[PDB]
Amino acid sequence: GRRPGRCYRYLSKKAYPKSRFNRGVPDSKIQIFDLGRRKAGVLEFPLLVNCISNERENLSAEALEAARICANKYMVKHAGKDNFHLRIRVYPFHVLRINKMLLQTGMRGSFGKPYGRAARVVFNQPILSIRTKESFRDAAVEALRRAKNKFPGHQKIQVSSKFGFTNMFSDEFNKLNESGRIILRGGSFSVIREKGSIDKFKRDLEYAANN
Amino acid sequence: AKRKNHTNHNQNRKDHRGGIKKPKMPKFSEFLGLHPATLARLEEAGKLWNAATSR
Amino acid sequence: RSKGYRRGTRYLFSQDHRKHGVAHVSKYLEKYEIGDMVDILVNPAMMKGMPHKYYHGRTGRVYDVKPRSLNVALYKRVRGKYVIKKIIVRIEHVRKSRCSEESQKRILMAAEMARDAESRGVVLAPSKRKIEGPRKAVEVSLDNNQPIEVGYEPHVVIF
Amino acid sequence: TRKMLQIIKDHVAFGTIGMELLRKLVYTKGSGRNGHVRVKLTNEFIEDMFDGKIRCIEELVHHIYNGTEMFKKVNSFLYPFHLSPPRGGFKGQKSKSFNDGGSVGNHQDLLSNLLERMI
Amino acid sequence: VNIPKTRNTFCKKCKGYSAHKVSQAKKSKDNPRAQGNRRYARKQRGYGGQTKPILRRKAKVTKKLVLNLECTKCKFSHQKPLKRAKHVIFGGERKRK
RNA sequence: AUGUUGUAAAGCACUAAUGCGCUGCGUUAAACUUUGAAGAUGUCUUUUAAGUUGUUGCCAGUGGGCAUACUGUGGUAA
RNA sequence: GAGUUUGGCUGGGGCGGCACGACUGCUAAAGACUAACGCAGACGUCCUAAGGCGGGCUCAGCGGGGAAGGAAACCACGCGUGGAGCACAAGGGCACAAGCCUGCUUGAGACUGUUCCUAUUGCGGGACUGUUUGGGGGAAACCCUGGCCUAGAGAUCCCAUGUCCUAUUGUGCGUGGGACAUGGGUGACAGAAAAGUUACCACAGGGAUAACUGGCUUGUAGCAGCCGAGCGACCAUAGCG
RNA sequence: AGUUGCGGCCAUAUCCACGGAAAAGCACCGGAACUCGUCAGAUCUCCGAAGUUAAGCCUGUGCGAGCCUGGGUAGUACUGAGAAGGGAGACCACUCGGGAAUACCGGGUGCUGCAACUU
Ligand SMILES: [Zn+2]
């Protein structure tokens, strides 16, 4: 029947993961977490837009699958297929239970059985993130606004000052990219420190000038 | 029928009335099961115990 | 929850990360005497002669020495009173206690100058310690060490 | 004694007192002890308890004010002062903390403008 | 369980070690002149039926195994108990490494 | 003065999980721990502060509890 | 035809299960103690070696080689912190070892005392000493009183066997009695000798406990909102969602 | 000043690459009648002294991997003791106290005991 959402909104103290004492758990409903072009280079998509949490609560696996379709379809219609990269950042590890009173036994023997899955979420945690070009800014702020109508509670949308999916501020990444200390291969990056052999250090400079 | 099972409520208040007292250590003539090597030098072994637990 | 002898000791009786292996040799060369204070501290690699988990981390006083073992006396609380207990422990689960180091080097120097005072006749026993008192006085100067001018400093946020 | 005062800080008010207010306590509300028995502070009862020592009330006040190593015997000789309520009231919730606007805790050197209305 | 048929061990008569033979010990007959059986038999005469309870509600399959150690000189015996052991064998055919 | 501890938080060094990019970025734990508090808990010294009990006789009632501040467990919840 | 019996726990009782004796990890909030028909499992055995001791060795796995030879046969070099094994549940422990191979053995001897779990307390299971006209292994230091450690457990009364004593008017005995130690068993495991039915029914009580109303709750039941993918010949909102 | 024999604490001592080394030592090294042990004198056991510093042992080097100790992260997270504070709740705030942890940066790389021997 799928009970209403208010029955499993708030966090228990401990998480109840699927592992070897549990064994009877249904499969997760979201299976894709990375959409868009997804192989673009780190220099291509400089802008980052997040959706931040203002609650402590569970996020259903159904609500995460419904918000992903809603946000992908808008960016494909207004931005273009090869113009963004979208990422889900949660993974529902927690398992929910039900006590299943079908004249039965009542509160006698009431430890319940596996029911569904959810992700646990805390104050100021990101939920969805998008990296794109500086011109498709208003398309990304409008796609995420439509998708948080799928979630319970309050959430905020912010435009960040970090560089893409690097976890690094925009002006620190820039002055390390001019000194030739960033190795940029297809999809990922890497920094070069002054720490090892001097010979090994100078091959890295040659990679970072070509690759 | 079906009632409560267990509680430790009020049990610290009972244990603390009149203080929680310590006995005194014995005088080395009261210990049993001593080794024969200590039964030889019994006079100057009692000096070490009796002067440490009553110092 | 059941009540075997080694009940509920998964973390208490364990080695501590790159400190595995059996007892080292200096642990057999220590010399124990009647009246010493000792710490009980289980080594989980030695199976024989070990005490019950209640006594791990307690300090006791020696009253007898056997060819491989010691007898220790100490106090245990049982809901409203204390009781004396007699433990038998092998030499591998025991170490000397440093719990009287402060009090012994202070009582030593006291009798030291007492002999050095009777040599001169002028003596005096009372040398009690005192707790730390209120505060003495200060004469702070600003010829160097110029002040730094601190304050409330408006609030900033970065995301 | 500073640690012991951290334990009872939500029930008392403590702080520092000067010398003109300390003389006004002992002369107005002071008594002695013969061991559980309360005796009046005369010059003759004071000599019998400190034989070759203090003989007036003003000497008791000047050992308390300094350290003077007779502090412990002079403070045990006194009986606790029993005061009145303050004329005017407290002006606060009074079970709130002093730095938060109440009357309980450390008044450090402003304790005199509560104690002078209770004597 | 497989136990050998001979053993060297201490004899309380010889007061040293010697060779013994091993087997299983068992219960003999009860005799009717011991005072307990005398008492139980006069109580069951006449009218009244069963006096003295008898046990139902049993729970046990095994008995302790008790050995008989018989010295080949002086012919002195002593008994010795072991654990539960459903099956017992005294001959041998040792299991080979 | 000198010993004991493995929780909260955090983390990936072991056990069990989890998306991508072809070295990095992303997500987890009552029955995971490389780390690790606040708090608790042993012993010595009144030759530290502040304060001012030991031994034993004859005997009663009681062994359905409940509320709350903070803190857990089961339950959609009460 | 007579007399009598036909346990208990329990989100009412009954049916079912055993949370009724007992071991490991978690619930448990960094000393110890701590509840639920809370979670995940295991117990009523097995072993003359799978017990004791001396010596010699190294395991899971990976890399490069070798007639028939292949995904898997056996020889053999270079590495391998245990990523393997150790009767069984789980936790702890272990590398010239507690693992593998091998030699000899019956300490799985006879007695005796102190102490822990553990108390106001029995039984049980462990630890540590002493005494022997006593063993085994080893050149020797040294170790050994069952199983690498934490489970595998049974009173009073009666009977069977062994050692030391004994029956009061005296002496014996093919007739008995005792002290101590082991075995025969009570699993509802501090331990009665025990089948049902009553709608023909009785008595002492119980709101400590059900079958109707009220009260707290809202999973289910009923009635509503928000979003905007689609539909509506065109056209997200005429109506739908 | 070192090496060797027997050690205590058990990585600041370990692991990987190159180099150095006067005198002694420690080795590698030549053999199998006896002792002892193997499929095999490879290992183990006995008897030796022609040769060599090639290795082992000991010492240097490296913006080396690890380990040890500091800084930053940060008065942040969490938290002991209080009060008729706010909020539908989830939870947030205030007063007096205590106070962590990766990623990043800097510096270090065995210390000692008893004995014998070496220009
Ligand atoms: Zn014999």
The resolution in angstroms reads 2.7
3-state helix, strand, coil in chain D (%, to 5): 35, 10, 50
> Measuring from the CA of residue A90 to each C1', which nucleotide is nearest?
F27
Q: What angle do CA D36, D41, D45 make, to 5 degrees?
A: 80
Whether residue C77 lies within 8 A of chain B, CB to CB, comes out as yes
Q: What angle do CA A8, A9, A12 make, to 5 degrees?
A: 75
Of B21, B31, B38, the CB nearest to C82: B21
For residue D11, the one-letter residue type is H
Using only C-alpha atoms, chain E has a radius of gyration, in whole angstroms, of 20
- Distance CA A122 to C1' F12 in A: 21
Name the residue with tokens 């989980």: C44
In order of A40, A47, A52, A106, A143, the CA distances from A159 in angstroms are 20, 8, 11, 52, 13
> Measuring from the CA of residue A106 to each C1', which nucleotide is nearest?
G11
Cα–Cα distance measured from residue E24 to residue E85, given in angstroms and rounded to the nearest whole number: 13
User: Is B5 strand, coil or helix?
Assistant: coil
Residue A192 Cα to ligand 1 midpoint, Å, equals 89
- Distance CA C56 to C1' H8 in A: 27
Distance in Å, alpha carbon of C35 to nearest chain B alpha carbon:
5
β-sheet bridge partners, residue A93 = none
In order of D58, D83, D84, the CA distances from D115 in angstroms are 21, 9, 10
Cα–Cα distance measured from residue E13 to residue E10, given in angstroms and rounded to the nearest whole number: 9
DSSP D79: P
Of C64, C75, C77, the CB nearest to B34: C64
Cα–Cα distance measured from residue A178 to residue E56, given in angstroms and rounded to the nearest whole number: 95
- Sequence-separated (6 or more) residues with CB below 8 Å from residue E21: E5, E6, E69, E70, E72
β-sheet bridge partners, residue E70 = E21, E77
Interhelix angle D57-65/D19-29, nearest 10 degrees: 140
Q: Is the CB of C34 under 7 A from strand F?
A: no
Provide long-range contacts, Cβ within 8 A and 24+ apart, for C4-9: C5/C52, C6/C53, C7/C53, C9/C53
Measured between its terminal Cα atoms, the distance across chain B in Å is 59
Whether residue C158 lies within 8 A of chain A, CB to CB, comes out as yes
Query: Buried b / exposed e across A184-198, counting CB within 10 Å, b at 16+?
Result: eeeeebeebeeeeee
D13-14 and D105-106 beta bridge pairing: parallel
Interchain pair A160, C159: CB under 8 A: yes
Tokens of E6: 């001979």
Cα–Cα distance measured from residue A191 to residue A177, given in angstroms and rounded to the nearest whole number: 9
Nearest CA to A33 out of A93, A88, A91, A92 is that of: A88
Tokens of C117: 């005072």
Q: Under a CB-based contact definition with an 8 Å cutoff, are residues A120 and A105 in contact?
A: no
Q: Is the CB of A167 under 7 A from strand H?
A: no
Interface B–C counts its CB contacts (< 8 A) at: 40
Report the 10 Å Cβ neighbour count for A85. Answer: 21
Residue of chain C whose alpha carbon sits nearest to that of B8: C79
Nearest CA to B49 out of B32, B35, B29 is that of: B29
Distance in Å, alpha carbon of C51 to nearest chain B alpha carbon:
19
User: What is the enclosing helix (H) or strand (E) of B40?
Assistant: helix B36-40
Report the 10 Å Cβ neighbour count for C36. Answer: 20
- D37 phi, psi to nearest 5 deg: -115, 135
β-sheet bridge partners, residue C90 = C69
Residue D95 Cα to ligand 1 midpoint, Å, equals 92
| Experimental method, per PDB record | cryo-EM
- Would you state the torsion angle of the CA atoms of residues C99, C103, C105, C106, taken in this order, to the nearest 10 degrees? 160
Q: Is the CB of E84 under 7 A from strand G?
A: yes
Name the residue with tokens 């999809």: A187
* Breakpoints of chain A, after residues (C–N > 2.5 Å): 102
